């Protein structure tokens, strides 16, 4: 329990600060280990609550210990910031943000399960942020109590876990950092049980046996790990696991560290009441008061806590091995900074200079109980932030030259983020983690605060990171729509990996990284964010209505008056041309002459036809056209607007089942009008044109980039799944992993992410973006063909009659 003054004083000696987090696969004990750290060294102040985001720890080392720290130290006190990290491990950007504000990591690995993919994923991301790792092989009690494992087997298991870890490290760690691998002999590996309160380092045992073996601990800790044997018969230390006679020698680690522990367990758990007092006396363990009466596990738990207190082992690795900000910002500056490496701000970052201009990185916005207010969480890399300070808020798109994302505003309050609570403070210098209140509106997710007009903006790991799983969301009670629209905004702001947008069909879409992620999101959206009954359903797939050939015969339709008639034919527009229209080469507003020269000279069109396009559709710019091919119609100019309008209507709502048309060309062959404009009016010709178009359409034989990264041996699953889903491989490139690119029909992608991990042993990672439209060859009017099934399902879903009206329904015989 410290006062604000004590805290602030502790924060001045950044050489004695440690910003870190705990990396662990679900169920490996990340929580119980931090509870242990908090109970042993947690810090607390001597009615606004927040979600616990970080916890402060306090630790003191002995004068000798502090001498061993291979980095700038000022005194024997240390302040440790245990920063919370998300639990979603899909190589998400929310995780990268959290790691970005840390410099070291305590990696938890299970004794039995060893290193699992989740573990490798966060560690890999961590290494990408140049974070230094330290390991704790947890759940050791399971191997002794449940599995009855032997000493050499336990050893071997430990050694294999350590090797698996240094494979990931040696693979992803920047060579500039040197050897960031972990070594039990160097004290960067702890072993223990977070559930039971005991742990140790070789160092602690070396200290214990050094002054006893008549040898300095530097020599002792090298001998207490690996292939070091002490032959009691010769009284000598060797590196051979056998003696001259060839008899088996027990490894020093097993003989001096494990055996005492093994004997304590065996004696206490078997109630050997005449063997326990001696063993405890020899190890100098003292039971006091009611403890003298304990037996079994109760006695064990109590005896091991006294013999080798857990928190102590962990704090030792944290203080002695994890880096303090001064050391790290020196080699992290350039990555962290987008600007010039020679820039005044970059240098201030390298020096962790508190007197320079401000360079504060906003890691994320954290939920508070202050009625819908989110506090900004981040780290001061340069300068010092102060309450009521005028600063420059620069979003993700800000550039020193433009005024985009820029927001100048005073910072209302600077708060210490201590777990679920906050503590207003006046200032905070470079090198520290901190929370800012009042930045809510201007920043959502990451950002960059500066006090320099020149200041440039700041930058991200082997879980899914793409919003491939999506559903349509809608309120059960129409009147709730406002809360839903608002809830989505709240949801988006709180989750970096969540996506929401409005579909072409007018549905609110919410997409998540994986099925589970999407589920949490929908639960939170419905219960909190929007707090209203929501209805969830598939996303509806949009289709296009086109023609495969020219009208088998002239389409003829008359107006309601029966006085006007339009004669036309429909024909396919080439894909390259549709694409050209959709992408900007052929435009609705371009000069008809130059456009026609292009369509004719470059796309094979007849220049007269091109010069005579009357309009594009739908919406006046779609990839469908009306070309005038009439010769001597007197009042043509007067019906043009009606014809154009009817086309916008026809191409917007196709006759197959109401989807928009695409790649449809309509040629007006002839028009017969009544002499009097009365009764030639839009109300007469618009229906005629739309009716004729639908008829020409139906008479023209109507019809309606998935990138995967993964290991070689897994690629086979990709082809396996794709073939089961009308997929098609596009490219197989590459000494990282492989990347297979393929086309996957959208209506074959629901659940794809699941079938893929299942076929690749969870090693493949998909990515999908809409690429193109593809024409289904089957008959849209045949309820049993592939296209027809889709058409029948949409028709029923919209309450239309099942049978698709045929062309005869729009043809008016002469």
């Amino acid at each position: 329990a410290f006062t604000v003054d004590q805290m602030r004083s502790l924060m001045d000696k950044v050489t004695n600060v440690r910003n870190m987090s705990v990396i662990a696969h679900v169920d490996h004990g990340k929580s119980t280990l931090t509870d242990s750290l908090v109970q042993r060294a947690g810090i607390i102040s001597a009615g606004i609550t927040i979600k616990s985001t970080a916890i402060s720890l306090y630790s003191e080392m002995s004068d000798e210990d502090v001498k061993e720290i291979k980095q700038k130290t000022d005194g024997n006190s240390f302040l440790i910031n245990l920063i919370d990290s998300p639990g979603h491990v899909d190589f998400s950007s929310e995780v990268t943000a959290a790691l970005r504000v840390t410099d070291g990591a305590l990696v938890v690995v299970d004794t039995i399960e060893g290193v699992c993919v989740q573990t490798e994923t966060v560690l890999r991301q961590a290494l990408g942020e140049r974070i230094k790792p330290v390991v704790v092989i947890n759940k050791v009690d399971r191997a002794l109590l449940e599995l009855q494992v032997s000493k050499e087997d336990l050893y071997q298991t430990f050694a294999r876990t350590v090797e698996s870890v240094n494979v990931i490290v040696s693979t992803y760690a920047d060579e500039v950092l040197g050897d960031v691998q972990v070594y039990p002999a160097r004290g960067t590996v702890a072993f223990g049980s977070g559930l039971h309160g005991w742990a140790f380092t070789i160092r602690q045992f070396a200290t214990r046996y050094a002054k006893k073996f008549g040898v300095d601990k530097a020599k002792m800790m090298d001998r207490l790990w690996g292939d070091s044997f002490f032959n009691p018969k010769t009284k000598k230390w060797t590196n051979k696991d056998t003696d001259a006679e060839g008899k088996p020698l027990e490894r020093a680690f097993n003989m001096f560290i494990l055996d005492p522990i093994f004997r304590l367990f065996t004696a206490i758990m078997n109630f050997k009441k005449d063997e326990i007092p001696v063993l405890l006396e020899k190890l100098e363990i003292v039971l006091k008061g009611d403890e003298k009466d304990l037996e079994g596990k109760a006695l064990l738990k109590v005896v091991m806590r006294k013999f080798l207190p857990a928190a102590d082992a962990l704090l030792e690795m944290i203080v002695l091995h994890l880096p303090s900000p001064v050391t790290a910002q020196a080699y992290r500056a350039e990555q962290l900074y987008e600007g010039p490496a020679d820039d005044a701000n970059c240098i201030a970052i390298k020096n962790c200079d508190p007197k320079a201009d401000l360079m504060l990185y906003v890691s994320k916005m954290v939920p508070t109980s202050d009625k819908g207010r989110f506090y900004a969480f981040g780290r001061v890399f340069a300068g010092t932030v102060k309450s009521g300070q005028k600063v420059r808020i620069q979003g993700p798109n800000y550039v020193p030259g433009k005024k985009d994302d820029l927001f100048i505003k005073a910072i209302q309050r600077v708060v210490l983020m201590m777990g679920r609570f906050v503590e207003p403070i006046d200032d905070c210098p470079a090198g520290n983690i901190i929370g800012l209140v009042g930045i809510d509106q201007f920043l959502l997710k990451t950002g960059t605060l500066t006090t320099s007009e020149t200041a440039h903006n700041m930058k991200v790991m082997k879980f899914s990171v793409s919003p491939v799983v999506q559903v349509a969301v809608e309120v059960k009670n129409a009147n709730d729509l406002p809360k839903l629209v608002e809830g989505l905004k709240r949801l988006s702001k709180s989750d970096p990996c969540v996506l929401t947008y409005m579909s072409e069909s007018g549905e609110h879409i919410v997409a998540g990284t994986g099925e589970l992620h999407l589920e949490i999101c929908l639960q939170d959206l419905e219960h909190d964010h929007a707090g209203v009954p929501l209805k969830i359903s598939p996303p509806v797939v949009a289709y296009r209505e086109t023609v495969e050939s020219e009208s088998s015969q002239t389409a003829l339709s008359k107006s309601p008056n029966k006085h006007n008639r339009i004669y036309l034919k429909a024909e396919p527009i080439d894909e390259e041309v549709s694409l050209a229209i959709e992408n900007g080469i052929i435009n609705p507003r371009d000069d008809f002459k130059a456009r026609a020269r292009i369509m004719a000279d470059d796309y094979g069109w007849d220049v007269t036809d091109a010069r005579k396009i009357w309009c594009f559709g739908p919406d006046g710019n779609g990839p469908n056209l009306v070309i005038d091919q009439t010769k001597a119609v007197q009042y043509l100019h007067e019906i043009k607007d009606s014809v154009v309008a009817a086309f916008q209507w026809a191409t917007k709502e196709g006759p197959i089942f109401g989807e928009e048309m695409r790649s449809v060309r309509v040629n007006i062959l002839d028009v017969t009008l009544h002499a009097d404009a009365i009764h030639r009016g839009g109300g007469q010709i618009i229906p005629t044109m739309r009716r004729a178009t639908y008829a020409g359409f139906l008479l023209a034989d109507p019809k309606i980039l998935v990138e995967i990264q993964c290991p070689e041996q897994a690629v086979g699953g990709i082809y396996s799944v794709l073939n089961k889903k009308r997929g098609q491989v596009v490219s197989e490139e590459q000494t990282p992993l492989f990347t297979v690119k393929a086309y996957l029909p959208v209506n074959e992608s629901f659940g794809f992410t699941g079938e893929l991990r299942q076929a690749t042993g969870g090693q493949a990672f998909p990515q999908m973006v809409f690429d193109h439209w593809s024409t289904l060859g089957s008959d849209p009017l045949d309820p049993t063909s592939k296209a027809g099934e889709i058409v029948l399902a949409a028709r029923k879903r919209h309450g239309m009659k099942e049978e698709v009206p045929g062309w005869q329904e729009y043809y008016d015989k002469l």
């Binding site: 329990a1 410290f2 006062t3 004590q6 805290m7 679900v26 169920d27 990340k30 929580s31 119980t32 931090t34 509870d35 750290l37 908090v38 109970q39 042993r40 060294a41 947690g42 810090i43 607390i44 102040s45 001597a46 979600k51 616990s52 985001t53 970080a54 916890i55 402060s56 720890l57 306090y58 630790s59 003191e60 440790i80 910031n81 245990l82 920063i83 919370d84 990290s85 998300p86 639990g87 959290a98 928190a311 704090l315 983020m417 201590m418 777990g419 609570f421 949490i520 639960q523």
Partner: protein
């Protein structure tokens, strides 16, 4: 650490896996931050 510094709030196991979902699955789902 709270034995050495009064200024550390202790958080117990159930204060960290405190969410109703976490309780329901018996795992951690959300990242927690402690000090």
């Amino acid at each position: 650490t709270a034995a050495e510094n009064p200024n550390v709030e202790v958080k117990d196991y159930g204060d960290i896996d405190k969410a109703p979902e976490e309780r329901a699955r018996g795992i951690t789902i959300n990242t927690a931050h402690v000090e």
